Amino acid sequence: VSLDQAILILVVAAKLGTTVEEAVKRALWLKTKLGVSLDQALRILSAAANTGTTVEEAVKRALKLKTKLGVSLEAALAILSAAAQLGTTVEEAVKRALKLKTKLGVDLETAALALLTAAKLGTTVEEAVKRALKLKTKLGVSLIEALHILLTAAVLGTTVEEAVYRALKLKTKLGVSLLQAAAILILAARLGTTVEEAVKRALKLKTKLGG
Ligand code: HEM
Numbered sequence: 001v002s003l004d005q006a007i008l009i010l011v012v013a014a015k016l017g018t019t020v021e022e023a024v025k026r027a028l029w030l031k032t033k034l035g036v037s038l039d040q041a042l043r044i045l046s047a048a049a050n051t052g053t054t055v056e057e058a059v060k061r062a063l064k065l066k067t068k069l070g071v072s073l074e075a076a077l078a079i080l081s082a083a084a085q086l087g088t089t090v091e092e093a094v095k096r097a098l099k100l101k102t103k104l105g106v107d108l109e110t111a112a113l114a115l116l117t118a119a120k121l122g123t124t125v126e127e128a129v130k131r132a133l134k135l136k137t138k139l140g141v142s143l144i145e146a147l148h149i150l151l152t153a154a155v156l157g158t159t160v161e162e163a164v165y166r167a168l169k170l171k172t173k174l175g176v177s178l179l180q181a182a183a184i185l186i187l188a189a190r191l192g193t194t195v196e197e198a199v200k201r202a203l204k205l206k207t208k209l210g211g
Pocket of ligand 1: 003007008011077078109116144148151155180190
């Protein structure tokens with residue numbers, strides 16, 4: 001596994017409340033039974049947690065949405081997640097996502113990520129997008145990267161500026177990417193532990209899984 005995948009396995013284990021070995025085995029099971037990538041399997045597990053449904057129910061609803069709309073599995077899972085976080089129906093979340101996709105000129109997955117991030121941050125999606133675009137221009141990151149920083153703030157419970165501070169510090173101290181730094185910070189929060197412990201666990205899992 002890559003460092004990204006190792007971190008995400010641990011995040012989704014924490015989100016589902018399973019053991020780490022159980023998360024790994026669920027991800028490989030989804031790969032085999034559905035023919036999806038590891039990343040897609042992890043997105044399925046994450047969306048199951050985001051929506052409070054069983055993995056089976058999340059897959060059923062995602063495949064239905066993906067087919068009805070003709071969108072990516074990734075986009076469908078993000079929309080399901082946004083609907084649950086917003087406390088609304090899938091149809092309502094789709095309407096919001098299509099509006100945003102049109103206004104910004106982004107793809108549906110990005111729009112859904114923005115809706116999810118804003119709901120978790122406790123802000124309107126216009127305010128979240130404004131802050132993300134400020135990060136994009138000032139830091140030279142992508143919109144997707146900026147939204148993950150907002151998501152980090154949302155999970156950690158800090159201002160965006162503070163999440164930026166912490167992620168850039170980790171980036172420089174560890175030589176990781178910005179997305180890796182965000183994800184480690186999220187992991188440490190979801191584990192109730194130090195960043196040092198989170199990093200240690202990600203590296204040990206990666207070694208246990210082959211390096
Ligand atoms: C650049 C392309 C990427 C895209 C389009 C993308 C998309 C997404 C989307 C749609 C979500 C929300 C869905 C969910 O909660 O299940 C998400 C959440 C997240 N992503 Fe990404 N992502 C990308 C890269 C990465 C990378 C490289 C990492 C790690 C190194 C990462 C780590 C995370 C984490 C930790 C979450 C939050 C999970 C949680 O709730 O704790 N993402 N991403």
